[PDB]
Symmetry: D3
Amino acid sequence: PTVFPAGPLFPTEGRIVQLFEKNTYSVVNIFDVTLRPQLKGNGSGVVWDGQGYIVTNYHVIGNALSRNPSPGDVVGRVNILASDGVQKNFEGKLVGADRAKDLAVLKVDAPETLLKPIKVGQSNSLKVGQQCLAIGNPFGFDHTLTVGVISGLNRDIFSQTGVTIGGGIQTDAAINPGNAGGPLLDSKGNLIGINTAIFTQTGTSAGVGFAIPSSTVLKIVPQLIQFSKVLRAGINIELAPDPVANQLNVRNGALVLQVPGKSLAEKAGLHPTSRGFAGNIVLGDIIVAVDDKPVKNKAELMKILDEYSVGDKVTLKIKRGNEDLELKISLEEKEHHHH
Amino acid sequence: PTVFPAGPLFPTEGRIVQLFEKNTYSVVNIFDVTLRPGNGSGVVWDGQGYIVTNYHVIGNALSRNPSPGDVVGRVNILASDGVQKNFEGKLVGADRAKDLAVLKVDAPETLLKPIKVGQSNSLKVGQQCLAIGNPFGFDHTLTVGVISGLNRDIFSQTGVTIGGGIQTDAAINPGNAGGPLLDSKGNLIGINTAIFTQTGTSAGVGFAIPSSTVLKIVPQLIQFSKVLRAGINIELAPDPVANQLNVRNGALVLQVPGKSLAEKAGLHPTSRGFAGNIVLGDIIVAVDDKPVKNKAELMKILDEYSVGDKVTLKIKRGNEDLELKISLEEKSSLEHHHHH
Amino acid sequence: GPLFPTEGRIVQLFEKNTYSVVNIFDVTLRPQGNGSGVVWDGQGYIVTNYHVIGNALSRNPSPGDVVGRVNILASDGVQKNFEGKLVGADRAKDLAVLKVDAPETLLKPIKVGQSNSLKVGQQCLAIGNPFGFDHTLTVGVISGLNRDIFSQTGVTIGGGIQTDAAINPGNAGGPLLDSKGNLIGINTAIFTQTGTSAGVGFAIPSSTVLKIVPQLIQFSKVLRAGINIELAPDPVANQLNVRNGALVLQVPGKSLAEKAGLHPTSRGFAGNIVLGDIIVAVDDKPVKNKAELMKILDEYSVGDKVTLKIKRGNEDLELKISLEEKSSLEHHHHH
Amino acid sequence: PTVFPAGPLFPTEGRIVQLFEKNTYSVVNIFDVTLRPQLKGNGSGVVWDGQGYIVTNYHVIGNALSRNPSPGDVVGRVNILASDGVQKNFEGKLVGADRAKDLAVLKVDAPETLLKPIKVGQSNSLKVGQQCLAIGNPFGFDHTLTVGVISGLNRDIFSQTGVTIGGGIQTDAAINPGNAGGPLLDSKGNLIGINTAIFTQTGTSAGVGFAIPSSTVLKIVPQLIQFSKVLRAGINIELAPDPVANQLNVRNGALVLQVPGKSLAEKAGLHPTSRGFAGNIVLGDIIVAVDDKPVKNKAELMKILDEYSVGDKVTLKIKRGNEDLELKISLEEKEHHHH
Amino acid sequence: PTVFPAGPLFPTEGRIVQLFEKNTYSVVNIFDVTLRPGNGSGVVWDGQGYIVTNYHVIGNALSRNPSPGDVVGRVNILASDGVQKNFEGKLVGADRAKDLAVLKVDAPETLLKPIKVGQSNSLKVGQQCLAIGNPFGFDHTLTVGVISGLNRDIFSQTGVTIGGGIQTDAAINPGNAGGPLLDSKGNLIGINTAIFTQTGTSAGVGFAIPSSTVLKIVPQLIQFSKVLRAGINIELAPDPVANQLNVRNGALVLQVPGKSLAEKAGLHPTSRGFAGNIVLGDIIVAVDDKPVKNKAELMKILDEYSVGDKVTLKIKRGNEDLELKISLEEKSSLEHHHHH
Amino acid sequence: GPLFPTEGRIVQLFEKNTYSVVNIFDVTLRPQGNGSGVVWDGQGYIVTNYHVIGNALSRNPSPGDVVGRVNILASDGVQKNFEGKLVGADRAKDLAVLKVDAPETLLKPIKVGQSNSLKVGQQCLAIGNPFGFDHTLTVGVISGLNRDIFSQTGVTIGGGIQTDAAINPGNAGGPLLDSKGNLIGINTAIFTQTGTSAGVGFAIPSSTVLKIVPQLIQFSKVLRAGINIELAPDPVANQLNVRNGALVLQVPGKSLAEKAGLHPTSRGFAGNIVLGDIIVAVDDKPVKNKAELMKILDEYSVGDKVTLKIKRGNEDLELKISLEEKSSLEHHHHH
C-alpha cells in the first residue's frame, strides 16, 4: 500500500509547529523528589533566565513544600532539553514559593549555553479570541502541545493548591497534567501565562482551563528570588467572587460576604451579608475604594492591598445601601475553596 | 527580564478577535429571578427588546407557571460605554420542546444591537464556529471549534431531547449556554444549549439549536406566547437506534400508547419476542405524498400541518408497503431522555 | 455560503474523505461496541479497532464469520449496507480487519500517510461514521507522539499518537487525517485511570496499521515472540532517572529471563530503590524505551536466540536468552 | 495449638441455627436463563406449595420478563435443596408476574417428596422490634442468613424494578443480592415477607432493607396462578408519599400531587399541588374516602382501588382547604421512581 | 395456603417490642420550618414541653440567625389515642459544638411523656442498645445493635466533630437522627447523631452524643440559650492521630494559631521537618494538678473552669517535663472535620 | 448497671478477650494499613492480616525487621508498646506473623476454635484494637460459609466465613469469636466490585490460620505447588449448572495443563457454551469445588506427579500432570 511522505505544511499549522519546536528547550520537566514512585505532583516548568532560575506551580512540588523546606533545599529534579535533543538532569534547589498564586521558583546549576529563557509577553493586553499554545514537558523525555484560544480574562483559578487565584486567563486549549506548570504562549511564542491545574466544583469538564497570567508571574518571581516569599498586607474578611456579587446585583466594588469574630474589620465598622429568618438576604458593605484608589471587584482590591505593608493605615470608601461612607483600618498579614 | 508588547494578530486569530468584540453587545446576561446564591446567556433578537435564550436558563422561573408579562429574569446588556446595564426581563413565551424562551426588555433602541441571523440549512461540517457567552453580566466568554455534526439529537438539560441539532467541538458549557453559536461571518447559526449525557464522561462535543428552528419558534412565541403543534402521539426510534436495527429510511415506530389515534388507525409498534425475533414496528416513509427520511424529518413535516388535518401515512410493515390514514391532534407529549 | 481559507480546506477535505469512512455495527449486539472503520483497499478490506467489534470477537469467530454490518457511503449520497466478514484481529494493537463484497465503484480506499514524520503542532481531522447515516468531524492538533494508549480492549498500546481533537464513540475506529487528508492513525477509544478528561485523545499510528493489517489479511492473526518480563512505562522510568533503554521492573520465578540472568527492580526496606537491568540493545540494535523494545522483538519468532545488552547499575553486561510466546497481553486496569 | 470443638449453643443462637437449617429446603435458587454469564438478575425464591409453584421477585427474572414471555415459557433455572443435602436443578416455567408488587411465580415439575412449602405468617400483626431472619440461596450450592429486627412497617419499597411498592416491611437485617427473592421469617420460622432489592436515592446505606409483606404475597400469587396477571382499576393521578404529605402537614388522606392533561381526574374535578411564582405552595385535593371506605394514606387508597374492576363508578370524599366535597369518577386501568 | 396467627414472642424480642412501644411517646418528629419538599426526630425532655434534638435537624433554621422564641420547627407528638398531634416548636437554644438544640412546645402536660435518662458513664461495650426515630411524624422506626465503642469522635453533619461519643452497630440514619439511643432498661444513653464519613463507604457503625453530655448541655441551653466555654484556642490531635505518633498519654498540641494566648504562653506545636524528623508539639498531661489522659478529657476538664481562670499546664516537650501557665478565654473556635 | 442475660454474656466475653487483641501500626506510614492483631502464644507471636502491614511488606522486609509497633493491653488497663518484628507473611491468605519481646504475664493468647464445625446462625463477636487506646466490638451471626473473600491485598481467598457483624478498619486483623469466645476467624477487610455495601463482612477461617501460621513461624513463607489454570468461582460454575468439581475455565498456551491434555471452557460464535473439563479428583481424592481443589494441591510440592480425574462433557477421563510453582496470585480487581 502506497505511503505518502510528509509534505509542506499549511501556514497556520506550520507556524505552530515552528513555535512549539523553538520553545521546547525553554520548557523543563520537574519531578518532586519527595514522592516515592510506583516501582512495579510533578509536571513542567519554564526557564526564567540565564542564571538557572526555574518557574513552576507551587502545586507541582506541593508535596515537597508540605514538608516546610528552606531555600537551598533540593526539592526537585529538573530535566532540561539540550540542543543535542536529549534532556539533561539537574538538581532543583528551592528558591521561594507562594501558595496564594500557586507559583514556585527553583534554581538550577547549569551551563548558560544549556539554558534558553522563555520570552515574556504582556498578559494585560490580551484579547479574547487570540490563539494560545500550552506546552508541557511532563516526563522529561518529550514535549506536549495543546492549542485553543483565550476564552476569558480576569477569571478565578480554583487551583489544586486549594486556594483560588484572582485575575486568571481562561483558555479552551486543554490544560492537564501533561502541561501543568508549563507556559501558555501567544501567537508570537511569548509567555502569557503558566498552565495551572484546577479542581472543579462538579465532576463534568466545561472544556476550558486556566493560566496564571504573566503579569502576576513577573510581579511574584523577583520577590521569591529576593525574599523567598511574598509578605502580604490586607483585611481578613471574605469577599464575594464576581459571579456571586453580580448575581446579587453588585455591579461595582468588593462585596463583603463575611466578617469573622472580633476582627480588625469588626472594630472598624464593616458588615457582612446574610439571610434572615424570613429567607430575606441582607447585603454587606461594598468596598469601592482604598484611600480612594478605586475598587471595582474583589481581584483588583487584592492587588491594591498586596503592595502596602503591614500596619499601613488606609481609608476604605464603602457603599452600604444607597449611602457612601469612609472607614479607617490598619492592615495585618493575610483562603481556600471546596473543590 | 524583558517584556514584549502586544504584537499584530495573525489573520485567523485576528478575525476571531474582531467578530467576538463586535458581537459582545448582542450577547446578554440573564439571571433567573427565582434563584439565589438556570442562569446564563441570551441574544438580542431585535430592536424592540426581544431577548432569545434557552427555556432552561430560566427553567426554575418557568416551572412556577408564570404568565406572559411576569418578570422572570434580570437581563444585563453591554452598552457602548463598556459597562453592562440592568433591565427587567418580562416573559414573552417559552417552548420546552425546542428549549427556547423569549423575554422582553424595555430599553433604548440605541442600546440594542440585534444579533445577525444566518441560514443553518446551508451549514457544512468543518466550518469554523464561535460560541459566545455572557454568563455573569460582567464580561464575555468565547470558545471556538468546528461544526462537528449535523441533525443530531440534543439531550437538553430541559429533560427533553431536541432533534435536528448542530454538533460542534467548541466547548459548550454553563459559561455560554443560551448564547449564540456564530459562523465565520458572525451570523447566528444556533443557540448554545446545555445537555445531560448518559455517562459522567465528556465526548468533547457540544450542541446548539439550529437558527432555522430559532427562526421558526421565536416569532410564534412573540405572537402567541406558545407553540401549537399538530402531530401523532407515538414513540419514534432515535436515528442511531433505527439504523442499528437496519432501518435506513423512514421513521421507525417503537411504541404506540394504548387506545390512541395511532392505535385506532392501526399503526403497529416494535417488540422483541421471547425467542428474540424482531418484528419491526411500522416504518413511516411518507406523509401523504412527501417522503420521510428519518424521525427529525417526520416531525419537521408534521409541524407544518394543522390540528384538523387528516393525512395518509405510507408505511413499511416488514416487507410490504401499506397505507394508514390518521387525523393529527395537538402534539402534547414530550420526548424525555432520562440522562442526568 | 462563502468560506475562509482554512475552514474552506477542512470542509472539502472532510467531504472528500467521508466516502472512505464506513460504519460498523457488531451483529452480536441487540439494540434498545459499534463505530467506524476505513476502506483499506478496492477488494473490500475494512480496517477498524478490535474494540468496535469486541463483543463479536469475544465469541471466537473464525475468519469468514459475519461479525459486523458495514454501511458505506455511495457516490449518490446514501449509505449502502454490507455483510462484514471477519478477516483477522489483533487485540494487542486494537486492530481488526473485515471484508465486504462490494463493487469497486463503491469503494474509495483511504490514502495512507507516514506517521513517523509527524510533528507536534500539525493539524489533524478525526472523522467518524458512527451510525451509518452521516459523518462526524473533530479538529485539533497533534499534541504528543509515542504515547501509551489505554485502549478499551484493556490492553496498552505503545507508540500512540496523542491529539487534542476530540476522540469519542462518534469517531472511534475512524481515521485520523493530516492536513493533506492522509491517514496518520486510527482514532482509538480509551479508558482513563480516573475518568477525569484531560482534553486529549489517541490514535494508533498508521505505521502500526501498515505493519499489522497485511498480516491479518494473510494469517488472521499476529503471533509474537518476546520476553516474559515487566518493563517500565516511559513516565515511570524517567521518574527513576532512566533516560535510555527499557527498564526491567518485574522478573518471574523460574523464567527464561531468570535463567538467562536478568535482574528486576527492587525497593529495599531501608527505604531505598535499586535499579533492575536496563535493556539497551537487542542484537546490538539500540533500544530507546519500552515501546521500541516491543517493536524490535515483534520482528523475531518463537525459539529465536538473541543477545541482550543490559545496564546493571553502572555496569555493562551481555546476556543470552531464547524468545518464547508471552504469558499475557499488557492489561492496564483502567475503566 | 489447642483447638476447642463445637460445643452447645446458647438459647437464642441455637433457635436461629435450627430455624435456618429447617427452612433452607424451602428456599430455592433461581437463575434467569436469558443471561449469558461471564464464562471467563438471579437470586432466591420460596417453595409456595406442594404443586411446584415458586414465588420470587419480578426483578430476579427481570431481564427474562423484559422479553415479553407467555405463561409456560421456560424463564428460570431453579435449584432446590433435597434431604440428600444436594441441590437438584429444575426447569422454571413462567406462571405469572406483577411488576407493581415485584412478584413473579414459576412452576416446577418436581416430586412432592422433594418439595417443602414455606410456612406463611400474618404480616398484618407484625410488631416493630420482632426478630427477623432473611434467608437466601443465591447460587444454588448453599444458603445465606442475615438477622435483625422489624425496623418499620408500612414503608415504601423503592424496588430495583423501578416501581415503588407501598406497605413494605423495613428491617435492619441486611437485605442484599445474597437474599433478594428469598423469605423474611419471624421468630417462629413463618414467612412474613419477601426480601426485596431496592435502589436508594443517595449512595449511602441507611443500614436497613425491605420485604414485600406476606399479606401482599398471599393476595397476589393466587391471581398470578389463575390469571397470569393482576388487572387493576384506579385513577391515573400522582399521589404524595406519606413523608412528603406529612411534611406539608397533610396528616390524613391521600394528597394529590399531580393531575395530568385531560385525565379522568381532570374531568371529575380533582386538583394537584404546585408552587406559585411567589414560591408559594398550593395544596391539591386530599382523598379521604372512596365511596366512604375511609382513606388515611396513599397506600391504603391503592389497596381500596385494587379490588374494584374497570368501569366501576365510585364517590371520592375529598378535602380541599377546610371544605369537604364528594366527587364522582369512573376507574380505568392503572409509576416509577428516580433511583 | 394456610395462615399462622401472631405467636408468643421470645423473651429478648419480647422486651424490645415493649420497650419500643413504651418509648414511642417520648420520641417526637421535628420538621425545620425553613425547608420545603435537616428534619428528623427529637426527645421529650420534660413535662414543660422542652424538646431535645440535634442542632443539625434544625440546621437550616439555625443558620438564619433566629432568636430564642422564634418558631423554627413543627413538632409532632404521639398521643395516647395513637395519632400524632402538631405543635409549634420555639427555639430555646442551640449548641453547635455538641450538635444539640432545644425547642419548646406548648402542650398539655398530660400529653408529654418525658424520656427517662440514664448514666452514659457506666456503659459497657457489648450492651444492647435501641435507636428510635420518628422521622416523618406518622410512625416510628427502630434499629438495634450493641454498644460498639466508647469515647469516639463523632463527625457530625454539623461539620464539627464531637468528642466523647458513643459508637454503636445499630444503624443510625436519617430515620432516627435526633432520636434517642436507649439501653436495655429503656434509659436514654445518647442522642442518635448523623455523621459524614471521609469515604463513600459504610463502616457499619453509627454514633450518639452521650447522655452525660446531653445532661450537661441541655439545662444550660434552657437557662441561657447558649453554652459559654472557657478554653484555649489551639489545635489538638485526634486520639487516633496521637497514638499513631506514639503519644499514649495526654493531649498532643498539633497547631498553635499565630499570636494567640497559647503562643505567648510558649506552647509549641507539631512540625514534620523536610528530612522527616518529628519534634512532637507539647503534650498536655495535667491541668494544674488533675491528670489528662487524652484530648477529650482535656476538653472536659477545661469546660468546668471559667473564662477568668489562670491554669498551670504540665507538659511533655520531647523528653523533659515542663510547666507553662495560661489564662483561659472564651473557647470560640470550632473543630471542623471536612468530611462530606 | 444490671444487665440481661445475652448482653451480660457479650459484655463479659468482650472484656475477657480485649487482652488478646493487640493494636498494630505499620512503621513505614507517616501520620496526619494499620489495625488489629491477635496474641497467638506466650512467646509473643502475633497474628494479623498481611494487609494491616501491607505498606511495610511491599518494601521487602526480612524476618527480624521492625515492620510494626504493637500495643498490648496489660492487666492494669493500659496498653504497652512493643517493637513488632516480622516473622513471616503469606499474601495468598492475607496473613502475617509478628513477634514481640514481652513478659509472659502481659501475654494472653487467644483461644482457638474449630471453624469446620461452624453453623450458619451462630452468634459472632468481631473485636478490634484499632488505635492502641481502646477496643471495639461488633456483633452479628455467621451469615454464610465457604465464601470468597475479596481481600484488600488484591487476592481472593477461598473458604472464607461470611458474617453480618460489621467488619471495618476498626476491627480488621482482629478476631472473630464464637459464643464461647473461641477464635473462629480473623476479621478481614475487603474491596467490593461496586462499593455498595451488602451489610455483610468476612473472616479468614481459623482452620486456615492454624494451617498457615506455624509454617510462617518456621519458614517465613508458604511455597505452593499447583496448576497454572483458571478455575470457575462457585457462583459462576453453579450458573453453568456445574454442581460438583472445579470447572476449568482458562488454559494457557503451551502450559503443563495443555501438554497434559486439559480443556478450557469455550463460547462458540454460534451463540453456544461448551464446558471446560471439570476436575473432580486429585489422586482419586474427591474435589468438590474450586476452594477444595486449592486446599488439596497446597499439600503437595513442586515437581510432584498427580492424577487428575476430569469430567469432559458426559465423559470420564484421567490425566497426568506435574505440579509447578504458579504464575500468579488470584487477583480480583475490586477497589
